[PDB]
Target: Glyoxalase/Bleomycin resistance protein/dioxygenase domain
Amino acid sequence: MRSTSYYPVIMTSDVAATAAFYCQHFGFRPLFEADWYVHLQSAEDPAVNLAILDGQHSTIPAAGRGQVSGLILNFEVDDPDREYARLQQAGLPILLTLRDEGQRHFITADPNGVLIDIIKPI
Amino acid sequence: STSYYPVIMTSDVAATAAFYCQHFGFRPLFEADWYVHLQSAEDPAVNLAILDGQHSTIPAAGRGQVSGLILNFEVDDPDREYARLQQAGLPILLTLRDEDQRHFITADPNGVLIDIIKPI
Model:
């Protein structure tokens, strides 16, 4: 019931541009914003959180420092068709066009190359 | 109870799934040899999927191996979790500490950091 009991933190060298991207296109707003760390939370569901971290910050154990890769963020939505139309027209990269699979979905990506899979259960 | 969750790419789906099921209370909701969807037994809202990072279903420019990721879990008793995990042989990247809110950091066999945190 704590909204923040589980969430991912992605490492990037462009914290502010990454945060702005999720706020502009994916319904997030900032709960904490600094140059090295931003915690975002979905406006419509406080249980959906994403934190964005400078991947060389000294507070990350040295062995884990780096840059995000090999990651997909899955979001379930009621109308992936409408979301595709909005995002494609906003100029986001389309990595996989809409298709039926029990999911109808499409795949885009953030400026770090994190894949974003927008899915309706079918 | 799967509206938002991460999917981590790995070269070893089976070992990565075993690690979370052995040490973090996950169980498979569904699976194939190239894809395992894990869900916490005790909190069904917590989900983590594990994907063969070279699978044909992934767009080519998205193929890869997970890096640059931390998973944050809030728990009641990070001290007890540290004792169990350290004794189980997991890597300890940050020992227990109180931040200026009590936590420690371990990692999965891909190098995903796992920050186990007790709230104020």
Q: What stands out?
A: The helical segments of chain B are 13-23, 78-87.
